[PDB]
Symmetry: none
Subunit: 65 residues, 8 copies
Amino acid sequence: SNAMMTKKERIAIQRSMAEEALGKLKAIRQLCGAEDSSDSMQEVEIWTNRIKELEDWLWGESPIA
Amino acid sequence: MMTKKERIAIQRSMAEEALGKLKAIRQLCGAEDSDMQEVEIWTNRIKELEDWLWGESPIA
Amino acid sequence: MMTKKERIAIQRSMAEEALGKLKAIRQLCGAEDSSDSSDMQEVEIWTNRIKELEDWLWGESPIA
Amino acid sequence: TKKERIAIQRSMAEEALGKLKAIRQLCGAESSDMQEVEIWTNRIKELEDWLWGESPIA
Amino acid sequence: MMTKKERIAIQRSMAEEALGKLKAIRQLCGAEDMQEVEIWTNRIKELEDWLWGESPIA
Amino acid sequence: MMTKKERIAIQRSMAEEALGKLKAIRQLCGAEDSSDSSDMQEVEIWTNRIKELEDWLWGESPIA
Amino acid sequence: MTKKERIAIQRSMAEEALGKLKAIRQLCGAEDSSDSSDMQEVEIWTNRIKELEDWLWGESPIA
Amino acid sequence: TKKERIAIQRSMAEEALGKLKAIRQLCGAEDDMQEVEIWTNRIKELEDWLWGESPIA
């Protein structure tokens, strides 16, 4: 290739961006029930599980694993 | 004007983004290749911060 | 595409953005229904923890 | 011969490495799990690199 | 006493020790005196890929 | 000093121990609270894969 | 199991790993043509094993 | 009477499972252990559904 960047570099950059993506999704989860002055988890759990699933895919199975 | 509890949720949301950026940093180690110890140093420091955030900090 | 120097420079650049985000958090410690002193103590706690991280980053870390 | 004694020492080192890797598999049996796993991975790879690269049996 | 996940972690620990023993065998090739080494390498890798990729403990 | 025949006998002895270890793993399937069919599915898979290895070791491998 | 139990089990396994490494060391210079070079090998093994053992019991996840 | 009808259905399910198991037993007769394991897995899946999630569980 006549490209400056290597495949290893491109994948590292992608993995770096994936951490930011995951940070954003986890940020979302933190607002569950922020409208509720009271205490209590089912909504939170749904997010936890979907994020874990994406995170397992990213680092286990994806093109950047 | 927000309640403290609302402000803390916002702060926690933002803390996830801060953690994301640190974790992004870590992924760049050796991209151009201490190799694995460099990465381990970041793991250990990010974990210490995450542990503080969710366990000891004002937003725990 | 990157030397190690360049990659480290890029990591240092990202570290400033991470620090910005943590300092942004510290600016939201005030609230309606909490005491000013309690919120002020939060600010002090954040400040000390951010300074500890900055000191590590620029002093002791792999990117110092 | 020193060579045959060295092969035997290398065979033994593989078994020591197996026992260390066995310890790694028990992490989290009961994030920190991933920190622990990474630390064992690295210590083990460091020992392997020493055994086969630097040690008297390299 | 054990959950299935704990039992599987124990089995994975044990599989590292079995791999260690096979790798130990490989190290004795030519100890008395290379395609032979390659045969072991390839067959160990096949087993290791199965264990961690496809087996009941993967 | 060591002959090739002796080296091969040593490798064969070690192979028996490796097989013993994989057979020991097989025995733990369903050790926990488990349904007889889950157990038996796992046991079959271990049995067949161990048998395949044994066949290779004693029939096709450098130590056969 | 508890984390304490799992850690105990890992420490017990570490002792066996250390035993196997130390066993290796005993075979250096087994030949009757052994000299200062063989003793140096022994020391090189001793030092590496001590580094690992100090890590295990001082700094590791199982310390 | 629904209970009786379900009992008869469960009785028949055992015969259906037996016939599938009968099929599995012919694998490799003419001599691939993966073929047998595929059958094991698919029979288990069905048996688990029958006694665990199905209308006759």
